Structure formats: structure tokens, C-alpha cells
């Protein structure tokens, strides 16, 4: 019982150029070699994510702008959020986010 979902709305009115203000990186199963999703590698202390006050490194992504990523590779997912954050989420000024983090 050390897992909790986190849905956040990240405004990038200014970060629109930086995408949002975070570095993403996903893993891959050891044997299955299947993408294990993306994880916040490093949040730009200043971007939209860091300003949101709800984004923290080591947070696994599940859905961005109402678009799940579990149905795609890490690179595809990070790219899916990239476009979703700089094309659909920015359109209004903020992108919807859904990440899962373990209690630690």
C-alpha cells in the first residue's frame, strides 16, 4: 500500500517554450524489455511544473491532457505529453497531468 495517483494541472503560459520545465525518462523491463513508463528525471526549478507545486522527481506518468501513455513506449509517451503539453495543454495555458508515485 505504498502507491498513490496524482492528477495535476500544470500552467506553462511562460514555460510554453520550455515545454513545462521538467526532464522525463522511462525504463524498460529487464526480461520483457517492455517500456516501464516515464519518470520525472528532474524538474526545472522554475518552469511550469516546478511552479505548479505538485510536481516532484521520480513521479511516473500515467496520463497527460486526458491521454494515457500506458498504451505506448516511453519515448512515445514523453513525446505524446510533449505535444499534448505544447499543443493541447498550452492552448489554454495549462496541461492536465496524471502521475503515480510510491510512498517513500
Amino acid at each position: 500500500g505504498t502507491r498513490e495517483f496524482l492528477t495535476f494541472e500544470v500552467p506553462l503560459n511562460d514555460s510554453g517554450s520550455a515545454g513545462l520545465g521538467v526532464s522525463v525518462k522511462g525504463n524498460r523491463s529487464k526480461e520483457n524489455h517492455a517500456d516501464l513508463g516515464i519518470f520525472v528525471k528532474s524538474i526545472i526549478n522554475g518552469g511550469a511544473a516546478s511552479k505548479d507545486g505538485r510536481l516532484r522527481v521520480n513521479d511516473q506518468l500515467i496520463a497527460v491532457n486526458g491521454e494515457s501513455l500506458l498504451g505506448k513506449a516511453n519515448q512515445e509517451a514523453m513525446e505524446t505529453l510533449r505535444r499534448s503539453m505544447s499543443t493541447e495543454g498550452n492552448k489554454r495555458g495549462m496541461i492536465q497531468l496524471i502521475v503515480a508515485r510510491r510512498i517513500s
Binding site: 515545454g19 522525463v24 525504463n27 524498460r28 529487464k30 524489455h33 526545472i44 514523453m78 505529453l81 503539453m85
Partner: peptide
């Protein structure tokens, strides 16, 4: 448990 071939993407 990565394959030592990960990568980061600035978003």
C-alpha cells in the same frame, strides 16, 4: 531495471 540504454527528454 533498465537496459542501460535509457534517455532523458526536456519537456
Amino acid at each position: 531495471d533498465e537496459d542501460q540504454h535509457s534517455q532523458i527528454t526536456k519537456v
